[PDB]
């Protein structure tokens, strides 16, 4: 589909058996989700944004369904205020900016 | 044009007569540029992203050309790590997400 930018581009995602709302963010290198208890191993990471850095847990080869489009990649989990879908997964669903 | 997301969607912008590189950022409500001298009046403001808040100077009704498309809107200037073009200007140049 096509998503205008009058409002935040929030869509429904499915991860780890749960439905969530997430922001399609062309300005995010990585996908960063609000605190959730995913199974398996992880590695610590620090990611920077406007204002500074936050600590997150890096999970690899995680499946996420974004508006029915599946993507498999790295998912970071930590104290983010909004679920963010980043370019690592947006590329996999064929997402483009168009003007 | 159509922009894929395998790389950061960086474009050349012109503001205050000066060229700069900036990030097309669907995850930003607002446009935030690195410290620079802009003509006209400004008001102090604060904006919060990942990591915390930063102090910015808000310039309203500023001419800015983004990848050949002209916009006139609010620009925030402050210690941002990257020049980011947010949805307030992305809507003016007719930008949408598509997948
Ligand atoms: C390298 O990849 C990343 O940096 N990605 C992260 C990231 O911060 N990216 C930035 C762009 C960015 C920032 C700094 C350096 C390079 C690129 C935005 O794309 C996403 C945030 C999300 C957010 C919404 C609400 C509240 C807090 C946070 N938007 C944001 O700060 O916007 C500002 C400006 O407008 C305002 O609206 C929203 C808040 C205001 C870092 C980790 C994950 C995301």
UniProtKB/TrEMBL annotation, chains A, B:
Membrane-spanning ranges: none
GO molecular function, one term: aspartic-type endopeptidase activity
CDD domains tied to this protein: HIV_retropepsin_like
All residue ranges annotated as the Peptidase A2 domain in the record: 20-89
Compartments it resides in: Host endosome, Host multivesicular body; Virion membrane
GO biological process, alphabetically ordered: proteolysis
InterPro entries registered for this protein in UniProt: Aspartic_peptidase_AS, Peptidase_A2_cat, Peptidase_aspartic_dom_sf, Retropepsin-like_cat_dom, Retropepsins
Top-level taxon of origin: Viruses
Keyword vocabulary terms for this entry: Aspartyl protease, Host endosome, Hydrolase, Protease
Bilayer topology: Lipid-anchor
Chain coiled-coil ranges: none
GO cellular component terms, semicolon-separated: host multivesicular body; virion membrane
The name this protein goes by in its record: Protease
């Amino acid at each position: 589909p096509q998503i205008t930018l009058w409002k935040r581009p929030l869509v429904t995602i499915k991860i780890g058996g749960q439905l969530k709302e997430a922001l399609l963010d062309t300005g995010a290198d990585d996908t960063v989700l609000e605190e959730m208890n995913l199974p398996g191993r992880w590695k610590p990471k620090m990611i920077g944004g406007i204002g500074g850095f936050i600590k997150v847990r890096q999970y690899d080869q995680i499946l996420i369904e974004i508006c029915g489009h599946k993507a498999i990649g790295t998912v970071l989990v930590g104290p983010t205020p909004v679920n963010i879908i980043g370019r690592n997964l947006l590329t996999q669903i064929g997402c483009t900016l168009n003007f």
